[PDB]
Structures are given as C-alpha cells and as structure tokens.
Design a protein around this ligand. Structure first.
Ligand SMILES: Nc1ncnc2c1ncn2[C@@H]1O[C@H](C(F)F)[C@@H](O)C1O
Ligand SMILES: Nc1ncnc2c1ncn2[C@@H]1O[C@H](C(F)F)[C@@H](O)C1O
Ligand SMILES: Nc1ncnc2c1ncn2[C@@H]1O[C@H](C(F)F)[C@@H](O)[C@@H]1O
Ligand SMILES: Nc1ncnc2c1ncn2[C@@H]1O[C@H](C(F)F)[C@@H](O)[C@@H]1O
Ligand SMILES: Nc1ncnc2c1ncn2[C@@H]1O[C@H](C(F)F)[C@@H](O)[C@H]1O
Ligand SMILES: Nc1ncnc2c1ncn2[C@@H]1O[C@H](C(F)F)[C@@H](O)[C@H]1O
Lengths: 291, 291, 291, 291, 291, 291
C-alpha cells in the first residue's frame, strides 16, 4: 500500500496537479496520493521547505515525498532523490507522533524527490541522509520532458516509479554532498539578552504569528514556560505575555498568548481571535524576544 | 474498506491536514480519507456544523466523521465520540441519496468524533444518537498530546482507530446527555403571517443566499411551490418571486429565483448570476418571508 | 482499480464535493476519486473545457471523467455520456505523457460525462468520439433528482455507475451529433503577417499569460523556436523576445520569456516572477504576435 | 468684486489648479476665485455638466463660470463663451435660493466659458442663452497655447479677462446654435405605469443614490409626496417606501427614504446611514420606479 | 473684512459647498470664506467637534464659524447661534497663537452657528458662551427651506447675514442652557496609577495616533516631559518611550515617539514614518498610559 | 493685494490648514491665500519640490510661496527664506504664461519660505536666488513655537509677515550657499543612443506617466516632434509611438501618446483613457527612451 505525499507550487485552480496524479496512478496503480499542499508562493524554496521538513514522523515507513517548486524547469538541471536517515521527533516538546507513546519510525524509511535547488535544505539538516542520486534514467523520467513542466516530468513521474519499487540507486549517478544545492538559513542572533529573528510565517487560517526562534534558542537563553516575555514585531509593535503551552492559557478570548507552536518554534497569537490579520502582520518582519 | 470523512478548520495552505492524514494511514492502512472541507472560519462552531450535518446519507455505512475546530486545544477538555441513530433523509423534498429510489441507510451506522464544544449540536438534533463517549484512552489518543494540535491528537488519531475497528465503547467513559455541549440555535419566528429568520450562509462560489427557514417552516405556513413570496433581506430589500424548484424557473439570466436549496432551506439567487457578491450580502442579515 | 476524475464548479468551501464523493464510494467501493479542480468560474463552460481537454493521456485506460458546471440544473435537460476516440498527444511538442517514450493510450479508452451544455466542445474536437448517449436511466440517476444539484444527480452519481462497469450504451438513447451542444471557439485570425488572438487564461498561481494561439498557428506562419517576436497585449502593451522552450531562457530573473506552454499554446511570462499580477493583465485581452 | 467659479477635472493633488488661479489673479487682481470642484471623473462631460447646471441662482449677478474637462486639448478646437438667459429656479420644489423668499436673479447675468465639447449641454437646456462666441482673440488666450493644458489656456485665462470686464462679444466670432456641441441626454422612459431611468450619481460622501427621474417625470405619472413607491435598482435590488420630503421622515436611523433631492430629482437613501456604500451601488445602474 | 470659516460634511466631490459659498458672497459681498474642512464622516458630531473647537485663537476677532453636519435636515429643528466667551489658549503648552508672544484675543469675539445637535458641545465646554439664540428669523433663513439642505439654509445663509453685521440677538429667541443639545464626552479614568482613555483620532495624512488624554490629565498624575511611559493601545500593544516634545526626539527614523500634540493631547507616532497605517490602528481603540 | 501661495503636507481632512490661514489673515488682513496643494506624501521633499518649482511665472510679482513638509519640526532647525532671481519660462516649449505673448515677470519678484531640508532644491536650480536668510526673528515666528507644528510656526506665520511687507533681510542672518540643504537629483543617463531615467510621477487624476527626461535631454539626442520612439517602462513594458504635442494626436481614444507635458518633460499616456491605473504603473519605475 504505497503512499506518495505530494507538495507543489502548482495550485488547485486548474488540472495541473491532476495530470501529475493521473501519471502516478498509471505507474503505481495501488498508490495512495496524499496532498501536502499546492498553494506555496511559487519559487519560494524556503517556504516549500517548511511544508515538508516535519512530515516523516507522521507517515508510514516507505512513504515517498514528492516535493517541488521548479523555476529551473526545462534546463539541464536534474532532480535529486534522497533516502533520509532519521525520521526525527518534533513538536513543542520533541516527541514521536501518534497514540500512546507515539509511533517510533525506523531509520532510512523515507525518500524525498525534489528539484536540486535547495528545497530539501532543512530536510537534510534535520533528518540527515543515507544516499542521494541524480534523477536521469529514462526508466523513471521522460526521454523528451515537457520544458515548462519539470514538476511533473522530474518529480511526479519518478516519485511514482519509486513508490512502485523502482530501486532508488538506479535513478542515476550518486551525488556528492557538495552537489546537493542548499539555501542559507539566516541564524537567530543573540543581541545582549534578547533573541533576534524573523516572522517565518503567518499561520493561516488563524493569523497566528510563527517565528524562526526555536525551542533550543529559548533554552540556550534560559527562557522556559512561565517566563514573562516582551516580543517585538516589525521593530515597532511590542507584545507582553508569559510563555505558555497553548492559546487558552491567555485567559479571555482575544488576549495575547506567546507559545511554542506544534513545529517547535516561538509563536504569538490571540486566544481564539486573529492576531496577524487586523494588524496586517507579515512574513519577514523582525521578531525580537527578551525576558 | 473503511472511510474517514474529515472536516477541519486547518486550511489547505500548509501541511497540517497532511500530518493528520499520515497518522490516519499509519493507524488504518486500508482507509480512504475523504476531505469534507478545511476552509471553515476558525472557531465558528455553527458554520462547521453546517458542513457536517447533511453527510451521513451520502456515505457508506460504517463511515467515521472526523469533524473539528478546536479552540480549547491543550486544555483538560476531551473529545466526544458518538454513534448517531438516524442517517436521515434530506434535500428539498426529504429523500435518500443516490440513483433510483436512493440508498436507504441503516440506523446506528455512523460515528462522529469531535471536540466537545457544540460542533455536533445539529448532528445530534437531526440524527439523534445511540451512545456517546469521552475520548480518553491512551490506546486511541497520545499520552502526551501536542498542546496546540488537538484536532490531530484528539480527533484525527482516534478517528483512525475507530475506522480500524477499535470498539467505540472502549474510548472512555459514557457521557450523559447534559455533558455534551450544545450551541443555541436561534429559532425561526412566526410574526403574524410572516416567517422571520436569518441568512445562514452565502453559498460560495455562486453567491446564492441561504436562509435558516426550513421546508418544514414553510409547510407550517402553507407555503408550497408556486406561491408568490415576498422575501425581505437585511430589513430593506423586498424581493418578490414565486417559490420555484430551481434557478432556471426565474426565466431570463439574472432574474430572481426563490427556491428550496439542496439542504432543505429557503434560499434566494439570481438565475446564472451572483446575487450576494455584487451587493455584498452577508451571513447574519435578517430574512423575512411572507405570502 | 477504477478512477473517476472529477471537475466541477462546486468549490471547496463546503461539503458539496464530499456529498458527491460519498455517493461515488457508495456506488463503486473500489474507486479512486481524483480531483481535477473545483474552483472554475461558475457557468463558464469555456473555462471548464480548458481544465478537462488535456486529461486523457495522463490517466489509466478506463478512467471516467465527471466534468460539470450545471446552470440548467432542475430542468428537463439530461447529461451526455461519451466514449472518446483518440486519447491524443499533447504538450509543446505533441507527445505521449510519462517516463521513457511515454504511455501510449488505446483508442476508445475514456468516458466523459457532463451536462449537455457545450462543456465537452473541445474534448470532442481534439479527441473525437465513438458513441454518445443521453443519461436518463433510473439505474444510474435518481428517480427524483434534487432540482438544484444536477452536478451530483446527473454527473457524479452516473459517473460512479460507469466506473463500476454499468454498460455505457444502457444509460439512455444514443445522441446524434447535432444534439450535442457546442460553444463557438473564436478563431485565431491572420492579419497580414501577424496572428491575432486573445489571452485565454491567466496561469495561476504564477501569473503567466496563456493565449489561444496554438503551436499549429505558429507553424503555419513559419514561427519556430529562436524567432524574434513582438507580442502585443490589450492593444497597447508590446513585449519583445525570442520564442524559447522555457522561462530560464530569458536569462535574468524578471526578464520576459515568450514560449509554448505545456498545453501547446503561445504564452508569455517573466522568468521566476509574475507577469500578470503586477500589471493586472486579464483573460480576454487581445494578443497579437508577429515576427 | 468679480467672482470666477471654477470647475475642472484637474484634481487637487498637484499645483495645476493653482497655476490657473495665479493667472486669474494676475489678470483680475480683485477677483474672488471660488472652487466648484476639481474631482470629476476626467473626460466625463455628463458628470461635469451636473456640477455646473445648478450654480447660477446661488451666485451674485456678473459671476463667470469657468468650467472644463478638455480631452481635445492641443487641437484646433476653441472654447465657447456664452451669456445665459434665465438664472432659473431649482430644488425639490423649484424656487429662488436665499433667505426670505430668495434672491431673484436678473436675466443675462452669468457667463459660462468651457470647451466646446458638450459640457454646457444642460446649462443651455435649463438656462437658455442670449449670445455665444468662439474664444480666439489673443487678447484673452495665449498666442502659443500649451498643447496639453487648454483648461488653463482656453478657459482659466479668458475667464479672468471676462471677470475683469473684457467685452464678451470681442473674444471671437459669434457661434450659431448648431456649432455648439451637445451630448445626448438619455430620456426617462414610461414602461407601462413605471418610470425607467438610471442612477445619475452616488451622492458622496453620504452614499445617497440620485436618479435622473425628475420631479416633472413624477408629476407626469401622478406621483406626489405620500405615494407608496417600489424603486428597483440594477434590475435586482427592490426598495419600498413612501415618497417623502426628507431623510428623517423614514423614522428610525437606517430606514429607507425615497425623496426628491435638492436638485429636483428622485433619490433614495437610508436615514443617517449610507445606502450605496454597503451594497456597492454605482452610477449607471438602472432605476425603475412605480406606484 | 469679515471672515466666515466653514466646516461641513458636504465633501468636495460636487458643487454643494460652492452653492453655500455663492450665497455667502451674495449676502456679504466683502466676505472671505475660509474652508476649515468638508471631509468629516457624515453625521459624526464628535468628529466635527474636533475640527472646530481649536479654531478661535487663530482667527481675527469678529470671525463667524459656520459649522455643520445636519442629519435632522428638513425637520422642525432650528440652528443655534452662540457668541463664545473665551477665545482660549491652546497647544501642547497652552498659549496664544502667532509670532512673538502670540495674538491675545478679546472675550466675546466669535460667533458659531450650527445645527442644535451637539456639534458645539466641546466649543461650549472649552470656550463658554455669553449668549445663544435659536435661528428662526426669515431675515436670515429661507421662508421655504430646501428640506434636504439645512447646512445651506440654516447655517451657510444665516452665517453670511451675521458676517454682514445682522444683529445676533435678532436671529430668534434666546435659548436656555438646557435647550442646547450636548453629546456625552466619555471621561478619562484614573485606574490606580494609570490613565485610561481612547484613541480619539488617527491623525491623517501622517498616521499619528491621537488620544483623548489631555495635558491636564497628565499633569494631574505628575507626568511631564522626560517621564518614561508605557502607553498601551487596543489592550495589547504596550509601547514604551519617554514623553518628548516632538517626533525627532525618538532618534532614528521609524522609532516610537510619545508626545503632546498641537491640540494639547497625549499622542503616539513613529519618527517620520506612519504608525497607524501599517498596523491599521483605529479611532476608538483603548489607550492606557502609566509611568 | 498680496498673495501667499501655500503648499503643505498637512492634508485637507482636518482644520490644520485653516489654523495656518486664520493666522495669515490675522497678520496680513488684505492677503489672498491660494492653496497650491496639501496632499503630498508626507516627508517626501522631492515630490513637494515638483509642486512648487513651476509656480512663479503664473503668479503676480510680489507673491510669497509658503512651502512646507517639516519632519524636523520641534528641533533647532530654522526655515530658510529666499528671494529667487529668474521667474523662468516653462512648458513644453519654454515660454511666459498668460494671454497674448504671456506675462513677462521681473527678476527678484518672488519669495519662497520653507524648511531648510532640501524642499527648495529645484526652485534654486531653475530660478537661482538673490538672497537667502535663516528665519529666526521673534517678530516673524513664535517665541515659543509649537513643537509638532513648525509648518505653521516657521512657515505659515512668517510668510504672512513677509506678505505684509516685513523686510526680508530682517527675518534673521544671511545664509551662505552651502548652508542651504539640497537633495541629490539623479541624472538622466545616456546609454548608447537611449536616454535612461525614471517615472517621476503618476499624473493624477488622469493616470498619465511623467518621466524625469526633459525636453533638453531629448534635444541633446536630436529627438523632436514626429520621431518614432520606443519608450520602455519598468524594464519590460515597451511602448511605441511618435513624439506628438498632445493626446489627441494618437488618434482613436485609448491609443498611446508620447508627448512633452506642460512642465517640459517626456511623458506617456493613452488618449482620453488612463494608462497608469489599469496596469498599476508607479513612480520610480525605470523609463528608457530611444529613436
Ligand atoms: N514564470 C515562471 N518562471 C519560472 N518558473 C515558472 C514560471 N511559471 C511556472 N514556473 C515553474 O514551472 C514549474 C513546472 F515545471 F512544474 C512549476 O513548478 C514552477 O515553479
Ligand atoms: N490622457 C489624456 N487624454 C486626453 N486628455 C487628457 C489626458 N490627460 C489629461 N487630459 C486633459 O487635458 C486637459 C488640460 F488641457 F487641461 C485636462 O482638463 C484634461 O481633461
Ligand atoms: N489562536 C488560536 N486560538 C485558539 N485556538 C487556535 C488558535 N489557532 C489555532 N487554534 C486551534 O487549534 C486547533 C488545533 F488544535 F488543531 C485548531 O483546530 C483550532 O482551531
Ligand atoms: N442619508 C442622509 N440621512 C440624513 N442626513 C443626510 C443624509 N444625507 C445627507 N444628509 C444631511 O443633509 C445635510 C444637508 F442638509 F446639508 C448634510 O449636512 C447632512 O449630513
Ligand atoms: N444561482 C445559480 N443559477 C444557476 N445555476 C446555479 C446557480 N447556483 C448554482 N448553480 C448550478 O447548480 C449546479 C448544481 F446543480 F450542481 C452547480 O454545478 C451550478 O453550476
Ligand atoms: N510622525 C511624524 N514624524 C515626523 N514629522 C511629522 C510626523 N507627523 C507629522 N509630521 C511633520 O509635522 C509637520 C508640522 F510641524 F507641520 C508636518 O508638516 C510634518 O511633515
């Protein structure tokens, strides 16, 4: 019962994703295709990375992740297919997902296939990898690929072959580590006592504000649950609240909650109301936190 | 071939729904996950209720409905799992769904699992229930649930256990009727000869106007197809048309149609044009109808 | 392993598509339902046609295409079910889809079911057909169809019967060619040396501009890759670039690319930036191209 | 103490109006320049006409009206200067303006100077004229007029000469009636018992709705104050109210008032709330009224 | 050389203000009409009050203030004309306006004429008055006033008679204090050490934030220039800055300044950047200040 | 009959301009105050400069220009008052303004008073100056200036004293040329045969596009009326048209006109339609022209 989990920038306003899916079912008739999301800002590899980095612990072992924004479509570039090492714990605390104590996942149990454009940067950082190959074999890609549709030709199609049991090491030559393109992750800075980062995302549809300041950055500064924080956004808008596990800890509906989100990052919200939308807060705004 | 039909407020702009789905396939490998919708206004339990109340007659017996907006995530609250009684006929006329005379559904054939926050109010009103339990067993929920993701921990995960055949009565203790939270449904008033209600929804993507005035309210006042109606919206827009089965009965494109929608409620539209969008008509505007 | 590929105007903001899907799984328990898209402009048959015409070569033989915008819902009209002839090659070059040399598809291998309102015009033009029937049998549609939901009653339901192996010729009487409604496709004009057409679509989410000027129209005028073109939009915005296979051929990010899209049509874009959105370019604007 | 009343399409976002005013004070040092308005939709002669037709009865005898939208700037066209005949009563009732019984104005007491492009159509209809001349003398216009600024060269400048006492008949040759350009005023139609016109303006900043249905059209159909009217806008939105003199006659704040505006035309509003803005009502929408 | 300073809700998008001005020049040929502003939110008497309360010290003695929003137009209501007592100092410090030590203004030197609807509430509070009359004489208003234009009939017209020297006490009968309508001014509360008020206005076009917390409220709590303040907006934005005289005192462009505005009220801004516009801050949001 | 022509960033949404005007009439009772405009983007000295540089030739000799955006309000900075040298010809051709051959203006006939922040940069470039003084005397400014209102205290007030005949050289000490702050005017570059500049302004309310490419730049490259030009905006929207004197020379309504505007600069428009608004063209976009 193979699964392909599919993340693209193709949208859901026409038949583009469906063309990919038709080919996936053609190649691997028993496959289940699970949509991750298709609404990422086109060509924003850092955003795409956020939608795929946390996936493995949630999925059955053997799942293939087909993950693509492909602005270099129709060039001599070729996709990378990697078998990751650690499925990796996650969340506010760092745990396995599932009922009971969670579902522990075996190492080496997931494949990602993507443009070699840095989309897999955080996947490789957080999970490591056991093997990586350039995707070139005409057994798994078209001999004559559609120039403007490499997300289909060089990701969707070969992902379905991999789901069907095509040997990963036969997709093409092995890639050395330096040949796998990475984007630079801007660091969270210490600035005296304060941590200085950025709003990584507006958390739709709630309008919560997610920062790139991780639990580990907070722990490094001695900030734990209960600490009274001043969190300043965009250089201008300050908020003040204690760090709490969840939204309802802020008390009344509309009150500010500062918390660790389900991906492990410092975040700010209103309790059962939107923070971001009324004040037009945006990704890329500065985020400074201090006790 | 178990089915989980999944309705949430998690959106389709990131991997949140996919994390839930991964766990569903982990727990119940043979499951089919059917998206109901994920775009409800967050925390609007009355809107969520509208998206789930009409579902049972359309689905195979044994379907599990995983339905969630979870503003009390991370608190001591626990979900409710209920086996409904009547699958219930529906539509403008009140019938079974499907070809021929429709698919008759057996009683006691569907389970809903939801936050205990009133989301199931109309489900319980229209279908009744045979049994209801608090969802507490660590066999079906995490021992250490993610504080900000109870839609996953307390709905998605246990729904998959239920779909896999976990006995409903083993999820936790039985709930008495008064322990199942309800929202108040404002009634349709008789006001002399007129029926007085509200616009329950703008029917996207068409911009039809749906009211909370049901067929049964119309029947009570003697109003049937062919009756010349005056339907006043927002206190000031007195539209006049006969009640007709469908949009084309209004004649020319753009003309006003007053009709019974597919959920059994009095509605108003233009024939193959949008009523609501040009005039910015809104949910919560008053709706008065009279012969 | 039957597949139904489902394209509607029902949106993804409520349970409407899910009601259709529940019935599809009820009728054909082994089916896979693949969403094409549900976000087309309601009642715009020409737009719907664009989302369904290219599908067959991507899907396994035996796939049923359930394709619907149904403004004549609740009238005496009945759907048409057709078995197409040629699956048809496609793309910028005209080829089979898939890995290697592509997946050759047998003739007569796909069924479309749709309102008989011209939605299938381009399907029939590009693929031909072997047989066409009016959908009337109460074995495949409701005896008492919901007046305002013919997309469910007269498309979704009978599509599932067809996917389950109900004989196509038993759905109702054969239709003569003249009884299958067509929309008029406005032609691309030659105007001296220039080709004169329209913007057929803004290609979301990228904001590329797609025209109705086909590869075959370009070939007729001797225009091939490398030709320096002047492409004028809306009568007044001229652009100049060579015809290239893909976006990156324009060089620097933001530069103009004029290319053949993956559906075989002359298009214009910026390289990894949006052309249409900053300048509010729109479907229906004139498009003139000349060497 | 001469007055120039100045209406243009030049806006108030730069120094354009001030350049005109500087020249007016240069030519006629004792002049008072009164702004009518400068925010008309550029080139919309019918809208400009509405802002100038009602002016004369309000101003001291001898006032010059400099009124201009000049899309034919820099062509061989020349402005028209006219001395009107009747100052003309106005309002809901048809009266002189001012305290007591009002200020009766002598005939032949006002000059309009405008592009000869139909801007003065309604001025001439409602007031008549005694004499009209083409504005060509280099004593009152530049010998070398700025091509793109005829509103200054051919209206503002010569208006100041006229205000200073330059003889009207010396500005250039007399114009015959047929040489004075007119726009066509679309008529109010009788359609059975109903009057069928258009929304002539959204009355900013209040969002009242003004129609082209005049008091005289209402009188012709026997409609007077107290008559219960059904007024339908845009073919779709009906309203019902009695015809009243003013807004407060509707009773509660927000209630619909149907009234005669201060220019003599049938209008619709909410009492101390905006009608047009919440429903996005627009100029050019149809307006049908019936008893 | 009489002056009428004219504040209305009539806008500057048509000839309405000009009709008023024409009549003013008709009645008082030597008058100078000074526009205060015409863009107030219609019917918002509290906003109108803010635009007129600070005026007297800036104008020559004998100036008439014609100030009007007239939602009760066409009713039996009549305007009030008042001679104020103290011209009153103003500003951040409380001083006369002008060069040197400023222009000292004599008592009893200004007349306001307005609808008797509370528009003059703050004028009377801050300046006091010596005499007040109902405006009823047909020597100064029309015998047959236009029902929908009392801002012209009952304010503009009689203001011009007053400017021309018509005796104030002859406009109609004297009004007792209780017959002059007032709106309620919500007070600034002391709440422990903090002062609790509201954002009175967004200061356009800069987007500074003006509160109803006056210098005198600050002085009462011992707060002077240099005091480190915490100013919380909307319950959740706790800005921190010293109280400074001006914007540049915040240092770098964009930094927060907390200051006393030119009307004497506690305000917050960014230095040469907009505070309110990026964050959509609004009038009516709470404003709490504390040392 | 003195004139003050007043340009500020104070807007027209409250009484701020009126406070300034009241003081101007207080100081100089016979003055005429002419509004230039009050809607400039706050603190944008380059934009303010565009609204004041062309004024002198239009106004009577002796006019005082009070021109202000004052972001350094409340600091030790003081305004500059300058007597300009040449009134300077202007327009597409370079001429005097007015009827006949125009009104020749004597040298040394206009005074500007402004913040010393570079607002007068282009005034001084295009007109030169005879004398410049720092504005410090308490005879012409307040002894205790309102910290946040220097546009009133240090521009409006002293302008009225200057209009009233206060000797310019007594306002304070003479300023050396290097003490008068200037902004840098980016040059128009020659780039092979092409001229490379920027869109200096969107010409509201028409949506014409004004560039910083002057007649003199065109003359330098041999470009005169009749030359076929390619004008490229924003790097990517090319237009092609001959250089013509005016809009109507483009022929049909909506056609592209490339012309010299009334300020002497290369511009592009549509004939009696908006160019900028439909395509959201903006100030600061690149503008390249070539024959
Ligand atoms: N204007 C553009 N420039 C660069 N890439 C584009 C593009 N429009 C779409 N794409 C890209 O083409 C990919 C396709 F191969 F699948 C999509 O995934 C893209 O991101
Ligand atoms: N793009 C355009 N096309 C035609 N006329 C225009 C224009 N832009 C401004 N105008 C016109 O030029 C006049 C001027 F002579 F005073 C203005 O009154 C205009 O309406
Ligand atoms: N700002 C907020 N306040 C309260 N609940 C929120 C929230 N943002 C998201 N949620 C809620 O978290 C749930 C999650 F547990 F699944 C979502 O279903 C909720 O709507
Ligand atoms: N829809 C409306 N309801 C109440 N008053 C209105 C109105 N529209 C305009 N006004 C009012 O009419 C006055 C006029 F007499 F001068 C204006 O000053 C008012 O605000
Ligand atoms: N206001 C309207 N007028 C005409 N058709 C409409 C409509 N609103 C929805 N529809 C149509 O009803 C169909 C249904 F039967 F499935 C949808 O597919 C529609 O296109
Ligand atoms: N937030 C702000 N920061 C800097 N200057 C400002 C400002 N708000 C208004 N101004 C400035 O204050 C001046 C005044 F003194 F007249 C106005 O002309 C301003 O440009």
């Amino acid at each position: 019962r193979p699964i392909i989990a599919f993340m693209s920038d193709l949208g859901t306003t026409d038949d583009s994703v469906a063309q990919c899916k038709g080919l996936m079912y053609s190649i691997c008739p028993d496959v289940t295709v699970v949509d991750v999301c298709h609404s990422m800002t086109p060509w924003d590899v850092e955003e795409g990375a956020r939608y795929i980095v946390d996936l493995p612990r949630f999925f059955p072992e053997g799942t293939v992740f087909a993950t693509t924004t492909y602005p270099a479509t129709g060039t001599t570039t070729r996709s990378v297919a990697v078998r990751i090492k650690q499925a990796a714990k996650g969340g506010a605390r760092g745990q396995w997902a599932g009922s009971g104590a969670g579902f522990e996942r075996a190492e080496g149990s997931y494949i990602y296939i993507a443009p070699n454009n840095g989309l897999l940067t955080t996947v490789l950082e957080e999970h490591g990898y056991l093997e990586a190959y350039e995707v070139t074999s005409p057994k798994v890609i078209p001999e004559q690929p559609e120039p403007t549709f490499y997300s289909r030709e060089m990701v969707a199609i070969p992902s379905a072959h991999l789901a069907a049991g095509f040997p990963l090491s036969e997709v093409g030559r092995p890639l050395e580590d330096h040949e796998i393109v990475r984007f630079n992750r801007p660091a969270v800075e210490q600035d005296g006592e304060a941590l200085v980062g950025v709003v990584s995302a507006i958390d739709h549809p709630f309008g919560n504000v997610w920062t790139n300041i991780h639990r580990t950055d907070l722990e490094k500064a001695g900030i734990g649950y209960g600490a009274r924080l001043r969190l300043t956004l965009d250089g201008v808008l300050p908020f003040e609240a204690p760090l709490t596990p969840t939204f309802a800890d802020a008390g009344e509906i509309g009150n500010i909650a500062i918390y660790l989100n389900s991906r492990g990052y410092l975040s700010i919200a209103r309790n059962a109301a939107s923070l971001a939308y009324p004040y037009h807060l945006k990704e890329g705004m500065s985020a400074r936190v201090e006790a």
